[PDB]
Amino acid sequence: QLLFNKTKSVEFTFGNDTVVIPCFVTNMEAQNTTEVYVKWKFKGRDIYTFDGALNKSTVPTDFSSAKIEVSQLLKGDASLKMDKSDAVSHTGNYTCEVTELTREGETIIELKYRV
Amino acid sequence: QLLFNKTKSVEFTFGNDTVVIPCFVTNMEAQNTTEVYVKWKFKGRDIYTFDGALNKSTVPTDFSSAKIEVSQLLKGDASLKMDKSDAVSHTGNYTCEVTELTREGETIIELKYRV
Numbered sequence: 001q002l003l004f005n006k007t008k009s010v011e012f013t014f015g016n017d018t019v020v021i022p023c024f025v026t027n028m029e030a031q032n033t034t035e036v037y038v039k040w041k042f043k044g045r046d047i048y049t050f051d052g053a054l055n056k057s058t059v060p061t062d063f064s065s066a067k068i069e070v071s072q073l074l075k076g077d078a079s080l081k082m083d084k085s086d087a088v089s090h091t092g093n094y095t096c097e098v099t100e101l102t103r104e105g106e107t108i109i110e111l112k113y114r115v
Numbered sequence: 116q117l118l119f120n121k122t123k124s125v126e127f128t129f130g131n132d133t134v135v136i137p138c139f140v141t142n143m144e145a146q147n148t149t150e151v152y153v154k155w156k157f158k159g160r161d162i163y164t165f166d167g168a169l170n171k172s173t174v175p176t177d178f179s180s181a182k183i184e185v186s187q188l189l190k191g192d193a194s195l196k197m198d199k200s201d202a203v204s205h206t207g208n209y210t211c212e213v214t215e216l217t218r219e220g221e222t223i224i225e226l227k228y229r230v
């Protein structure tokens with residue numbers, strides 16, 4: 001149910017020292033990163049994950065420069081940054097997946113009848 | 116992770132034509148009731164549920180009058196209202212359970228290189 005400001009593609013040349021792959025959720029609700037999860041995929045593997053429960057990011061060695069700016073996630077910006085080496089060696093189709101996890105709670109009230 | 120403005124118990128007398136059992140979530144995030152689920156339990160059974168995704172409420176016949184005001188739910192007010200006849204036969208501990216459903220989405224961007 002999260003909605004995106006979509007972009008078909010972006011382009012870089014040998015002049016780019018670094019690249020940004022845009023990803024913007026337009027209907028974020030999370031007030032804290034604790035229930036946000038972000039996954040970037042490339043050719044069907046996870047090349048970046050942010051686990052908001054842990055406030056930690058995991059990257060594979062072949063995408064060692066991949067990062068998001070966690071300070072922007074609550075605005076719905078999940079944009080992927082990386083160095084040109086990683087960009088050049090991984091041109092093609094990227095998937096940006098964002099999740100806001102379930103939240104629940106309960107409370108107990110006793111209903112009393114007085115006479 | 117949902118938090119409540121709690122009340123240990125609420126009293127009613129013969130004068131109450133209807134009864135209100137308070138339930139107030141203090142940290143709601145949902146912007147649409149389609150994402151919210153409410154379950155009121157009494158003695159180990161579900162005596163009222165609202166499935167926000169379906170915009171539908173279910174009650175057992177022994178709580179036929181039981182309801183919430185859906186218009187108040189995004190404020191975190193999941194308070195249960197019933198007739199005195201349904202209340203007087205069912206004194207004791209009520210549990211109010213509120214859930215804000217997970218939300219996910221994905222988008223694809225091609226990173227293209229230009230010579």
Ligand SMILES: *[C@@H]1O[C@H](CO)[C@@H](O)[C@H](O)[C@H]1NC(C)=O
Nearest residue numbers: 010011012013016018019020
């Ligand atoms: C590469 O650099 C140009 C020059 O500013 C910029 O417009 C473009 O967005 C960059 N490409 C990417 C994919 O970051």
Ligand SMILES: *[C@@H]1O[C@H](CO)[C@@H](O)[C@H](O)[C@H]1NC(C)=O
Nearest residue numbers: 091092093094223224225226
């Ligand atoms: C990326 O996806 C598009 C279709 O969405 C496809 O036409 C294109 O060939 C893909 N790019 C690569 C490098 O496979």
Ligand SMILES: *[C@@H]1O[C@H](CO)[C@@H](O)[C@H](O)[C@H]1NC(C)=O
Nearest residue numbers: 125126127128131133134135
């Ligand atoms: C019963 O009525 C009184 C006064 O009208 C009110 O203060 C009280 O909250 C009511 N009790 C319930 C359980 O609704």
Ligand SMILES: *[C@@H]1O[C@H](CO)[C@@H](O)[C@H](O)[C@H]1NC(C)=O
Nearest residue numbers: 001146147148149150168170
């Ligand atoms: C809430 O979300 C649903 C699903 O997108 C939509 O149909 C509905 O119009 C929205 N607004 C209200 C007031 O229910």
Ligand SMILES: *[C@@H]1O[C@H](CO)[C@@H](O)[C@H](O)[C@H]1NC(C)=O
Nearest residue numbers: 148149167168169170185186
């Ligand atoms: C659920 O019912 C309410 C009636 O107050 C309506 O406003 C809302 O649009 C309905 N939810 C939908 C269509 O998702």
Ligand SMILES: *[C@@H]1O[C@H](CO)[C@@H](O)[C@H](O)[C@H]1NC(C)=O
Nearest residue numbers: 108109110111206207208209
């Ligand atoms: C409701 O719960 C409390 C637990 O704090 C318990 O002391 C009490 O006996 C329960 N009331 C009824 C009517 O079973």
Ligand SMILES: [Mg+2]
Nearest residue numbers: 100101215216
């Ligand atoms: Mg949520």
